[PDB]
Amino acid sequence: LGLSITGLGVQYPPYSLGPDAIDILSKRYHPESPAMKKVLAINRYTGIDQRSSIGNPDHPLVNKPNPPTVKELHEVFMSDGVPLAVEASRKAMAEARLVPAQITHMVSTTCTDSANPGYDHYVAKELGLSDRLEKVLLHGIGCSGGLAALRTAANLCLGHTARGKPARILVLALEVSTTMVRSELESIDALQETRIGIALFSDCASAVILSNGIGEAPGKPAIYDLLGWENRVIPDSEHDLGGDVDPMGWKVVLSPRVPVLAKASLQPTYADLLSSLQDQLPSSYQKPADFDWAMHPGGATILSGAESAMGLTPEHMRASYDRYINHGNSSSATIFSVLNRLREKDMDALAPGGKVKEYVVGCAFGPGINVEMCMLKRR
Amino acid sequence: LGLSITGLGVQYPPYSLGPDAIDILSKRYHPESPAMKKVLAINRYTGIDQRSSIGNPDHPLVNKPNPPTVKELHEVFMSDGVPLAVEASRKAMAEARLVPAQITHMVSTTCTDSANPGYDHYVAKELGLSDRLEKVLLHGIGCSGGLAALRTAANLCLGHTARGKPARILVLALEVSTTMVRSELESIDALQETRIGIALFSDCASAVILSNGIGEAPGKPAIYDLLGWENRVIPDSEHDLGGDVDPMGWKVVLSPRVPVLAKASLQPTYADLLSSLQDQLPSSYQKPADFDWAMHPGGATILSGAESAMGLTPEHMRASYDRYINHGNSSSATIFSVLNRLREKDMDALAPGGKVKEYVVGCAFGPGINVEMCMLKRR
Numbered sequence: 001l002g003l004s005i006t007g008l009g010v011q012y013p014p015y016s017l018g019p020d021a022i023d024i025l026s027k028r029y030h031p032e033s034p035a036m037k038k039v040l041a042i043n044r045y046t047g048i049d050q051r052s053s054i055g056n057p058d059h060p061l062v063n064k065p066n067p068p069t070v071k072e073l074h075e076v077f078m079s080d081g082v083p084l085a086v087e088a089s090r091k092a093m094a095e096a097r098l099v100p101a102q103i104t105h106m107v108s109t110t111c112t113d114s115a116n117p118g119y120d121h122y123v124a125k126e127l128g129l130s131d132r133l134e135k136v137l138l139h140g141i142g143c144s145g146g147l148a149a150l151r152t153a154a155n156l157c158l159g160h161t162a163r164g165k166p167a168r169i170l171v172l173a174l175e176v177s178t179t180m181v182r183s184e185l186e187s188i189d190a191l192q193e194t195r196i197g198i199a200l201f202s203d204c205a206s207a208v209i210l211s212n213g214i215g216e217a218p219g220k221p222a223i224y225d226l227l228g229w230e231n232r233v234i235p236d237s238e239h240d241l242g243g244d245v246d247p248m249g250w251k252v253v254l255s256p257r258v259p260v261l262a263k264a265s266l267q268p269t270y271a272d273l274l275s276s277l278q279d280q281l282p283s284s285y286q287k288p289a290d291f292d293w294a295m296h297p298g299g300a301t302i303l304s305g306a307e308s309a310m311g312l313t314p315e316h317m318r319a320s321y322d323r324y325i326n327h328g329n330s331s332s333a334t335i336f337s338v339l340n341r342l343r344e345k346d347m348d349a350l351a352p353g354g355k356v357k358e359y360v361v362g363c364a365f366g367p368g369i370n371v372e373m374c375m376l377k378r379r
Numbered sequence: 380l381g382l383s384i385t386g387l388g389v390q391y392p393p394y395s396l397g398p399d400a401i402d403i404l405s406k407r408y409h410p411e412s413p414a415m416k417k418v419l420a421i422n423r424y425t426g427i428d429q430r431s432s433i434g435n436p437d438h439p440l441v442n443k444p445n446p447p448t449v450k451e452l453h454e455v456f457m458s459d460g461v462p463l464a465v466e467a468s469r470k471a472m473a474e475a476r477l478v479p480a481q482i483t484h485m486v487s488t489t490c491t492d493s494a495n496p497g498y499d500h501y502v503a504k505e506l507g508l509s510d511r512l513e514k515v516l517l518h519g520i521g522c523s524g525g526l527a528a529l530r531t532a533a534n535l536c537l538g539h540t541a542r543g544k545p546a547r548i549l550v551l552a553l554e555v556s557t558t559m560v561r562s563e564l565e566s567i568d569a570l571q572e573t574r575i576g577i578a579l580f581s582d583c584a585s586a587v588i589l590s591n592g593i594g595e596a597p598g599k600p601a602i603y604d605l606l607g608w609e610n611r612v613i614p615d616s617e618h619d620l621g622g623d624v625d626p627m628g629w630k631v632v633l634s635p636r637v638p639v640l641a642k643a644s645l646q647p648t649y650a651d652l653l654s655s656l657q658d659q660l661p662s663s664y665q666k667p668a669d670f671d672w673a674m675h676p677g678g679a680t681i682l683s684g685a686e687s688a689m690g691l692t693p694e695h696m697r698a699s700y701d702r703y704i705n706h707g708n709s710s711s712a713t714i715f716s717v718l719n720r721l722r723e724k725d726m727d728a729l730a731p732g733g734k735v736k737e738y739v740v741g742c743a744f745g746p747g748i749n750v751e752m753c754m755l756k757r758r
Contacts, residue, residue: 070626113624116622116745121617131614134531136515136531137517137520138515140494140497140498141497152515155484155539156534158538158541159536159537162537235510245450245493245494247449247450370496
């Protein structure tokens with residue numbers, strides 16, 4: 001298809017918070033309750049060592065009489081999130097060796113902000129991109145957004161290919177979830193529901209450049225070739241995963257059906273993916289264990305579930321574990337971060353049986369329930 | 380290019396807000412104030428007779444002690460907005476003669492909701508579209524959404540053209556702005572500023588089918604052929620136009636420079652559109668007056684500005700005035716409404732010189748400031 005990822009860039013915020021961060025904030029704003037106690041216990045069952053944040057438990061935004069309003073959250077998204085997105089994008093462009101004028105489209109995603117003009121406008125301006133830039137700011141998809149944006153970009157690349165025009169697409173995901181800690185704490189205390197969002201979520205910006213190969217030299221280096229993709233919605237599962245707009249931001253919806261539903265979709269989706277391009281693949285890339293897996297680590301149950309459904313070991317998703325354990329669930333931004341870390345040296349030495357795979361399956365789940373998969377060829 | 384609009388459907392809600400409507404709620408919920416008084420005066424000369432609304436001034440959502448919250452807004456967006464989108468979509472598809480199965484992508488836009496799953500999910504579900512449908516829900520763009528979504532769809536179509544695949548794309552716009560009347564009224568009262576948003580905005584859902592022509596019912600009818608498009612951002616105009624997320628929804632942003640900025644952008648955007656294709660067009664279609672103009676009617680001065688800048692009579696924008704006077708400004712949903720109205724017989728009766736034009740310039744403006752144009756060939 002002539003589709004390649006030529007650069008990847010990732011920027012985490014300055015702070016790394018342990019499991020005691022929410023304990024501190026919880027004690028500060030709420031007296032002990034049964035639901036709060038269960039959530040604080042759950043916080044430590046995740047297997048997340050540290051979580052990346054734009055601030056620490058002493059940040060004034062999370063320390064007002066009430067949770068910050070959705071308006072106040074936007075202000076911090078712009079002041080503290082947007083700089084992450086700019087840097088992430090720069091680094092992707094620098095690896096791709098592109099100057100701003102060469103960028104033809106921008107596909108961006110977030111579920112932790114709403115704004116007109118969108119945040120992608122401000123990033124583009126800071127990077128100094130064309131006033132004629134074609135932009136798409138995706139909404140409504142949460143965690144599936146990184147791979148959703150990547151697939152949307154791929155269709156847009158081919159659009160330009162059809163017209164014999166070069167396409168270079170900045171693909172960007174930015175999430176600031178940690179600012180909604182007070183919103184979640186109040187819901188837990190007020191509703192006495194065990195809401196586990198605060199146990200999982202973190203802040204990140206990640207970016208890739210996707211090229212359609214037109215107007216690049218034959219033999220130009222890429223990082224991954226994009227071979228194919230699948231997207232499906234799991235039936236009657238809207239209530240299981242979501243984010244409901246609220247005076248306080250976005251109230252996470254996260255049911256116990258999610259791991260089960262997500263697990264059941266892997267095999268059938270992977271089968272569809274593989275059978276679309278099996279004739280493009282070598283004999284050594286037939287079965288699930290033959291691949292590295294770039295899985296969105298929505299939670300621990302996702303990874304162990306994937307190893308169970310697909311007959312994989314933890315090391316098959318080594319970069320997913322590394323992201324999850326060291327940075328937590330950064331929603332849509334996590335997948336590109338997983339693809340970034342996967343190609344680094346210390347990951348290579350952890351490959352199953354010393355076997356660094358030429359082919360990579362990326363996988364993400366989001367509200368819908370939307371499932372996204374893609375096949376990559378690693379140069 | 381082989382891109383054509385094969386169906387269009389518009390669904391306004393049943394109710395009409397007369398100029399009296401804001402006077403009523405104004406008096407019911409606020410004392411008299413200088414700023415309120417100015418807005419009420421401006422309301423009489425917007426040029427709008429009736430605004431289409433999901434409710435009357437007595438609707439319960441806008442008659443609570445407080446303005447409704449962004450959450451309560453979302454509930455009514457879902458119960459009262461989505462059905463409009465489903466009906467608009469059904470009609471586009473019916474005109475296109477497509478069954479739900481043939482729909483390959485959906486590009487949707489709104490600036491008056493935030494949700495995960497986004498509203499396009501519930502529409503596609505109710506329509507019975509495929510579980511493998513590729514969806515794009517645009518955010519950040521307000522009134523330029525219609526044409527921004529039509530352009531994105533065109534690129535996606537071409538993406539499938541590159542792969543020899545038929546593409547049939549549901550392009551959908553849904554706005555519910557009238558529910559934010561108490562938010563605007565409270566901002567007028569508390570801040571003592573002339574905020575004209577309440578005099579202008581109305582509710583609508585509109586949709587088109589864009590086909591890539593591959594595997595069509597051959598000799599294929601279309602309503603319009605999409606020949607070309609142009610998009611630009613006006614630098615340093617972010618603060619001139621917008622919609623800031625708020626616990627009460629989205630606060631309108633609207634400086635005095637908008638009419639001037641918009642009018643001045645027409646000349647260069649048009650010249651660029653035509654340079655990209657003036658080789659395809661007959662010599663009888665060279666100057667702005669040669670075309671029919673499907674203008675987004677942002678306000679009365681937008682339309683008069685376009686007449687002045689481009690040397691047009693109001694009849695050149697006959698369908699634009701027709702929607703603006705009778706239904707008001709439905710943000711992103713208006714442009715497919717203008718396009719649908721334009722091809723009707725009683726619009727043909729009002730063409731300049733009795734000359735119905737074969738080529739149509741679509742034009743819209745929104746937060747950015749983003750500007751969109753397109754060229755269409757009317758069958």
